[PDB]
Amino acid sequence: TIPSSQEKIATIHEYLLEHKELEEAMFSLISQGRGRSLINMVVKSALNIET
């Protein structure tokens, strides 16, 4: 399984450290009970940028 989940998470982690505004924004949504809309929005975008 390549890339592994660990490599995928590591990539996201490094990206958050390079863009702290995204870290703050995700934390804000998740800690305030809005994680589901975060998922929905990002999945849809990923699937469009593919399709």
Added chain:
Amino acid sequence: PSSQEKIATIHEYLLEHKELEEAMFSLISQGRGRSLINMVVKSALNI
């Protein structure tokens, strides 16, 4: 909350919702990280 606490919170959420891990990884690795940031920041600023 410290920055480490915020990352720990995000990390647990990603393990609980693998589609979000996969979708973020796809956007970042395909050079669309900036649009990902913009969308999430906008959303967080409205909420």
